[PDB]
C-alpha cells in the first residue's frame, strides 16, 4: 500500500520539489524497450514534464544486466529515478546493492539521498519492496489493499517475532510466505491508464493524452482480453467527456475527430483490400483453416454468397465501390452467422485530422509494433543485435508525432510484410506436423527453413506463437497445455526459446473467466538452471524467454519434462 490510487498526486509533488531546477538535471527515467504501454506512458510523462519545465533524460534499456551496469555510473546528483515497465517482481535493493544507511543525507525517519519509483504491472509483487523497503517506492493500483491482507501480517509479524508455540507458528507462517510465491505471472492493468489517472487528478487531460491512453490500452487486446474488457467502458466515458461540441458546421484543415465507430477484427482494413483483411486474420484463419485449400474455397464461397464480386473485394479500400462500402454492416450482420464469424464485429476508436484520412487504434499499434521489430566472438554479435533493438525505440517514438506520417506509412508496409512472412512460416509448420505433443507441454523447434533471421527478435517469435495459439484454441481438441517455441541462429549457434501460455476461445462464455492462466516457465527455468551448469542466458525482462547454446538444448528440455509445474 505504498502509493494508492488516490495518493498518486502527492508523489508527483515530490518530483516537483526535489527534481525541478533551471540549472541542473536531476531526473532519470529507465524505460523497458520492446513494449508499447511503457513507450506511451513515457511519452505522456515527457509531455507533462515539458509543460512544467523540468529537465529530463530517457534511457532505453533491454535487460537486468544493463540496468545494473547503468545504476553504478549514475551519480548522486540525480535525486529521482523512474523505472517504467519492470522492477516489481525482483528485489531491487539486493539487486542494486543499496544500503539503506548509506543513503541518509537528511538526518532527522530518513528523507534519504535518492528516490526510486517503480511503475510496473507484472504481478505477483515482491513482498520486500512492498512492505520492507523505504528507498524503493511503487505506484500501486489496488492489488495490495485487497489481495495481500494476510501477507502483510505474516511479513511484519515474522520480522518482529524473530516455547513450542514459537516453533509451530514460525513454520506455519513461513508456509504462508512460501505459498504467496511459487505462483505464475500475469498482467492485470495498464501503465497508461495509471498515468491518465494521474493526469485527471492533476487536471491536465486533453485529446492527445486520451489518444495515447487508448493506444496503450489497445496493445493488451491480443494477450490479455480481460483487462481490455475491464478498462473499455471508462475509455468510452472519457471519449464522450472530451468531445468538443455538437453540430460541427464544416470540415476545416485543423479539426481533430475522435469517434466511436464500428470496426472489425480484421488486419489493416483501411490500408489494404477486403480479401487481404479476411486472409491474414488470426481469428478468421483459426475459424476457417485457410492454410489449406478447403479454407480458401470456403472463403471464396462466403464472398460469393455475400454479394461482393471477387474483383471488387480485391481493390484498395479508398477506391472500393461506394455502394458496397455503405452497406457493409448489413452484409456482415446477415451473413457472418453461417460461418461462425459473428464475433468479428465490435466497436473501437477512430481518429481523423483534416483532409488526411482515418486511422484506427489497432492499425496504429500494429504499425508501432512493426517499427519496433524491423527498422533502420558471439558476445559482440549479440551486443550489436541488442544495440539495434535499442535503436528501433526512437523510430517507434518518432511515429507518435503528428508531423511524421511517412514513418507511420513505412510502419504499415513493414507490418504487412511481417504478417505475410509469419503466415508463410506457419503454414509450413502446420503442414509438416512439426508440433510434438508431449505429456506436459507441446514442443516446436525450427531448425531448418528460409528467413530464420527474423526470429532472433522476441517480438516476431511472439507473433508466430500468437498465430499458433490462436490456431490451437479453436481446434476441437480440448487441452490447455503450455507451448515451447525454439528458433536457431546460425551466426551465434544459439537457440532462442520462449514459453507460451494457453488461451481460451475468444467467444467462449464467462463461466471460466477468472484471473487468466498463470505463466510458470520462469520458476521452472530458474530451477533447472540452478541445479545444472547449463550454458543458458536468462537476462531478458520477460522471464519466459531464454537463450540456450545449441549443444545443451536436447538435454535441458529432457530435464524440463521432469521439472513439473507445467
Closer residue to another protein (CB): 77 or 380:
77
**Nearest distance in Å: CB 461, another protein:** 23
Closer residue to another protein (CB): 79 or 213:
79
| Residue 59 sits in the site that holds another protein (CB under 8 A) | yes
- Alpha-helical segments (H) within 336-378: 361-373
| Residue 355 sits in the site that holds another protein (CB under 8 A) | yes
| Residue 510 sits in the site that holds another protein (CB under 8 A) | no
Cβ contacts of residue 211 below 8 Å, gap of 6+?
A: 258, 351
Q: After which residues do gaps appear in the chain, with C to N over 2.5 Å? A: 108, 162, 376
Grid cell locating 87: 522492477
**Nearest distance in Å: CB 36, another protein:** 18
Closer residue to another protein (CB): 105 or 438:
105
C-alpha 265 chain-centroid distance: 19
Distance between CA atoms of residues 201 and 190, nearest Å: 17
Closer residue to another protein (CB): 406 or 533:
406
Closer residue to another protein (CB): 46 or 466:
46
* Of 53, 330, 379, 562, the one binding another protein by CB under 8 A: 53
Nearest-CA neighbor of 267 among 468, 415, 475? 415
User: Helix or strand or coil: residue 29?
Assistant: strand
Closer residue to another protein (CB): 61 or 496:
61
| Residue 390 sits in the site that holds another protein (CB under 8 A) | yes
| Residue 305 sits in the site that holds another protein (CB under 8 A) | no
Cβ contacts of residue 249 below 8 Å, gap of 6+?
A: none
| Residue 46 sits in the site that holds another protein (CB under 8 A) | yes
Q: Residues 73 to 102: which contact another protein by CB under 8 A?
A: 73-75, 77
| Residue 257 sits in the site that holds another protein (CB under 8 A) | no
Cβ contacts of residue 454 below 8 Å, gap of 6+?
A: 374, 418, 421, 460
| Residue 272 sits in the site that holds another protein (CB under 8 A) | no
User: Helix or strand or coil: residue 188?
Assistant: coil
Q: What is the DSSP track for 448-500?
A: SSS-GGGTTSHHHHHHHHHHHHHHHHTSSS-----EEEEEEETTTTEEEEEEE
CB 442, CB 435: distance < 8 Å: yes
Distance between CA atoms of residues 86 and 63, nearest Å: 10
| Residue 21 sits in the site that holds another protein (CB under 8 A) | yes
**Nearest distance in Å: CB 355, another protein:** 4
**Nearest distance in Å: CB 73, another protein:** 7
Closer residue to another protein (CB): 390 or 428:
390
| Cis, bond preceding 124 (omega within 30 deg of 0) | yes
**Nearest distance in Å: CB 357, another protein:** 6
Distance between CA atoms of residues 79 and 170, nearest Å: 39
Distance between CA atoms of residues 287 and 283, nearest Å: 6
* Of 165, 252, 376, 554, the one binding another protein by CB under 8 A: 252
Distance between CA atoms of residues 432 and 449, nearest Å: 12
Rg (CA), the chain: 25
| Residue 56 sits in the site that holds another protein (CB under 8 A) | yes
* Of 3, 8, 49, 349, the one binding another protein by CB under 8 A: 49
Sheet holding 358-360, edge to edge: 256-259, 350-353, 358-360
Closer residue to another protein (CB): 103 or 180:
103
| Residue 253 sits in the site that holds another protein (CB under 8 A) | yes
Backbone angles phi, psi at 22, to 5 degrees: -95, 5
| Per-position x/- string for 107-126, each x denoting binding to another protein as judged by CB under 8 A, each - no binding | ----x---------------
* Of 169, 206, 236, 316, the one binding another protein by CB under 8 A: 316
**Nearest distance in Å: CB 120, another protein:** 21
* Burial grade of 336 (CB within 10 A; 0-12, 13-18, 19 or more): middle
Which H, E and C letters describe 310-333, residue by residue?
CCHHHCCCCCCCHHHHHCHHHHHH
**Nearest distance in Å: CB 379, another protein:** 17
Q: What is the size of the binding site for another protein (CB under 8 A)?
A: 45
Closer residue to another protein (CB): 79 or 520:
79
Q: Residues 357 to 376: which contact another protein by CB under 8 A?
A: 357
Q: Which stretch binds another protein (CB under 8 A): 16-24, 221-229, 231-239, 428-436?
A: 16-24
Distance between CA atoms of residues 204 and 202, nearest Å: 6
Q: Which stretch binds another protein (CB under 8 A): 44-52, 189-197, 457-465, 532-540?
A: 44-52
* Of 318, 330, 379, 562, the one binding another protein by CB under 8 A: 318
CB 239, CB 261: distance < 8 Å: no
Angle CA(30)–CA(33)–CA(36) in degrees, nearest 5?
A: 110
**Nearest distance in Å: CB 128, another protein:** 28
| Residue 466 sits in the site that holds another protein (CB under 8 A) | no
| Residue 204 sits in the site that holds another protein (CB under 8 A) | no
Distance between CA atoms of residues 139 and 128, nearest Å: 15
| Residue 394 sits in the site that holds another protein (CB under 8 A) | yes
* Of 65, 391, 413, 526, the one binding another protein by CB under 8 A: 391
* Of 50, 297, 346, 515, the one binding another protein by CB under 8 A: 50
| Residue 258 sits in the site that holds another protein (CB under 8 A) | no
| Residue 105 sits in the site that holds another protein (CB under 8 A) | yes
**Nearest distance in Å: CB 512, another protein:** 44
The footprint of another protein (CB under 8 A) covers 17, 20-26, 28, 46, 49-50, 53, 55-60, 70, 73-75, 77, 105-106, 111, 252-254, 314-316, 318-319, 322, 354-357, 387, 390-391, 393-394
Amino acid at each position: 500500500m505504498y502509493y494508492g490510487i488516490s495518493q498518486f498526486s502527492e508523489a508527483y509533488n515530490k518530483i516537483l520539489r526535489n527534481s525541478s531546477s533551471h540549472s541542473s538535471c536531476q531526473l532519470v527515467i529507465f524505460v523497458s524497450c520492446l513494449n508499447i504501454d511503457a513507450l506511451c506512458a513515457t511519452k505522456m510523462l515527457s509531455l507533462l514534464f515539458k509543460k512544467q519545465l523540468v529537465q529530463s533524460q530517457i534511457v532505453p534499456i533491454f535487460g537486468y544486466s544493463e540496468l545494473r551496469r547503468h545504476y553504478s555510473q549514475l551519480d548522486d546528483n540525480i535525486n529521482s529515478l523512474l523505472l517504467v515497465g519492470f522492477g516489481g517482481v525482483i528485489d531491487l535493493e539486493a539487486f542494486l546493492e543499496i544500503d539503506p544507511q548509506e543513503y541518509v543525507i537528511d538526518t532527522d525517519e530518513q528523507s534519504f539521498r535518492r528516490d526510486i519509483y517503480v511503475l510496473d504491472a507484472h504481478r505477483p509483487w515482491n513482498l520486500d519492496n512492498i512492505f520492507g523497503s523505504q528507498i524503493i517506492q511503487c505506484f500501486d493500483d489496488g492489488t495490495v489493499d485487497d489481495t495481500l491482507g494476510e501477507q502483510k501480517e505474516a511479513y511484519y509479524k515474522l520480522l518482529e517475532l524473530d516455547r513450542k508455540q514459537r516453533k509451530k507458528q514460525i513454520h506455519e507462517y513461513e508456509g504462508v510466505l512460501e505459498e504467496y510465491y511459487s505462483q505464475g505471472t500475469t498482467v492485470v492493468n495498464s501503465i497508461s491508464a495509471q498515468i491518465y489517472s494521474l493526469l485527471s487528478a492533476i487536471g491536465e487531460t486533453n485529446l492527445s493524452n486520451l489518444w495515447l491512453n487508448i493506444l496503450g490500452t489497445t496493445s493488451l487486446d491480443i494477450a490479455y482480453a480481460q483487462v481490455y474488457n475491464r478498462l473499455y467502458p471508462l475509455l468510452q466515458d472519457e471519449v464522450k467527456r472530451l468531445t468538443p461540441s455538437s453540430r460541427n458546421s464544416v470540415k476545416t484543415p485543423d479539426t481533430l475527430t475522435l469517434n466511436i465507430q464500428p470496426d472489425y477484427y480484421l488486419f489493416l482494413l483501411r490500408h489494404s483490400s477486403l480479401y487481404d483483411s479476411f486472409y491474414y486474420s488470426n481469428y478468421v484463419n483459426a475459424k476457417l483453416s485457410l492454410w489449406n485449400e478447403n479454407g480458401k474455397k470456403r472463403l471464396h464461397k462466403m464472398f460469393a454468397r455475400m454479394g461482393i464480386p471477387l474483383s471488387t473485394a480485391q481493390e484498395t479500400w479508398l477506391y472500393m465501390d461506394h455502394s458496397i462500402k455503405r452497406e457493409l454492416g448489413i452484409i456482415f450482420d446477415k451473413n457472418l452467422d453461417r460461418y461462425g464469424l459473428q464475433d468479428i464485429i465490435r466497436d473501437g476508436f477512430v481518429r481523423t485530422l483534416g483532409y488526411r484520412g482515418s486511422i484506427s487504434a489497432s492499425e496504429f499499434v500494429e504499425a508501432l509494433t512493426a517499427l519496433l521489430e524491423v527498422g533502420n566472438n558471439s558476445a559482440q554479435k549479440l551486443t550489436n543485435l541488442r544495440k539495434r533493438w535499442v535503436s528501433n525505440f526512437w523510430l517507434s517514438w518518432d511515429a507518435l508525432d503528428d508531423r511524421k506520417v511517412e514513418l507511420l506509412n513505412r510502419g504499415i508496409q513493414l507490418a504487412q510484410d511481417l504478417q505475410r512472412a509469419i503466415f508463410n512460416t506457419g503454414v509450413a509448420i502446420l503442414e509438416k506436423k512439426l508440433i510434438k505433443h508431449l505429456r506436459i507441454y507441446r514442443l516446436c523447434v525450427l531448425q531448418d527453413g528460409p528467413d530464420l533471421d527474423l526470429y532472433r527478435n522476441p517480438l516476431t517469435l511472439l507473433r508466430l506463437g500468437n498465430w499458433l495459439i490462436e490456431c490451437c484454441a479453436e481446434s476441437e481438441d480440448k487441452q490447455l497445455l503450455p507451448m515451447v517455441l525454439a528458433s536457431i541462429d546460425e551466426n551465434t549457434d544459439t537457440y532462442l526459446v520462449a514459453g507460451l501460455t494457453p488461451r481460451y476461445p475468444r467467444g467462449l462464455d464467462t463461466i471460466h473467466t477468472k484471473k487468466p492462466i498463470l505463466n510458470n516457465f520462469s520458476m521452472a527455468f530458474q530451477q533447472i538452471t540452478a541445479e545444472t551448469d547449463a550454458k543458458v542466458r536468462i537476462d531478458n525482462f520477460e522471464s519466459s524467454i531464454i537463450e540456450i547454446r545449441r549443444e545443451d538444448l536436447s538435454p535441458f528440455l529432457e530435464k524440463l519434462t521432469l521439472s513439473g509445474l507445467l
